[PDB]
Design a protein around this ligand. Structure first.
Ligand SMILES: Cc1cc(NC(=O)[C@H](O)c2cc(F)cc(F)c2)ccc1-c1cnc(N)c(C(=O)NC2CC2)c1
Length: 259
């Protein structure tokens, strides 16, 4: 007797993000399509109050870098053997963004003349201003990767799924030594800003050149081409979080004086 099937008309599955299913589905009443994320909560009554704390905090979020929230409800569906094992589902209804994301955008633009310094920065600033907002509400994203950077049907850049918890964008302290600061986010931004400015022909050559930059090894053409941005991306990829800039400081940099 589940609220989803009765009140939403499925369209397609979009992925299984964080081992949780995400559906494009039309609300029968308002006749609008929505991205509907569904996870099973942990069974621990302790580690549920954890997840239920996050959703209450995320529902307060209002910013132009943050995918518009609509609703979040719970469903318990009541043969096999004699393990009952109770399974409660958390549904989160969000604004449906484009099926294609910043990696899709990047994949279809593998030449210098297709990566205008102007446009790349404009995409980065929208990400940074979202990460800043999150940090200011005492949250971190810890999930920044082109794969998970979306566009609204209106081409507003959005930071993708986060909260309710590839590693090429992850920070050293995030992968291992798992008591990290919010500055893990600044590491990810660092690689992303670089990647936007630096088009990649082939996936192997990307993974190589990102792994280089990740260890402060920068293609000599990139440094010469974009000198200010080089300076920034070094700081963002600083091995000590403390020496990495706060999103507010990145945003207020000269580089972003244009419209
Ligand atoms: C499902 C989904 C969740 C969020 N969640 C938050 O941002 C955050 O968890 C939050 C929760 C809250 F309750 C409130 C918030 F303000 C934020 C953001 C975006 C999408 C999404 C939207 N449209 C899409 N087309 C897709 C898509 O194509 N996904 C496939 C897997 C790759 C995903």
């Amino acid at each position: 007797i589940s609220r989803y099937l009765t009140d939403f008309e499925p369209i397609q599955c979009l992925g299984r993000g964080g081992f949780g299913v995400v559906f494009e589905a039309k609300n029968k009443v308002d006749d609008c399509n929505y991205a509907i994320k569904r996870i099973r909560l942990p069974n621990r009554e302790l580690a549920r109050e954890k997840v239920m704390r996050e959703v209450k905090a995320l529902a307060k979020l209002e910013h132009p870098g943050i995918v518009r929230y609509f609703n979040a409800w719970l469903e318990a569906p009541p043969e096999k053997l004699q393990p009952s094992s109770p399974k409660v589902y958390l549904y989160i209804q969000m604004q449906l963004c484009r099926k294609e994301n910043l990696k899709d955008w990047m994949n279809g633009r593998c030449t210098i003349e297709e990566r205008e310094r102007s446009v790349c920065l404009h995409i980065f600033l929208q990400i940074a201003e979202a990460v800043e907002f999150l940090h200011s509400k005492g949250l971190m994203h810890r999930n920044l990767k082109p794969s998970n950077i979306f566009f609204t049907m209106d081409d507003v850049v959005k930071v993708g799924d986060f909260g309710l918890v590839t590693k090429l964008y992850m920070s050293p302290e995030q992968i291992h030594g798992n008591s990290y600061s919010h500055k893990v986010d600044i590491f990810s931004l660092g690689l992303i800003l670089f990647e936007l400015l630096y088009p990649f022909s082939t996936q192997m050559e990307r993974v190589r050149t990102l792994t280089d930059v990740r260890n402060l090894k920068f293609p000599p053409l990139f440094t010469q081409k974009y000198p200010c941005e080089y300076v920034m991306v070094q700081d963002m990829l600083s091995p000590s979080p403390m020496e990495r800039p706060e999103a507010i400081n990145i945003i207020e940099n000269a580089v972003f004086e244009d419209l």
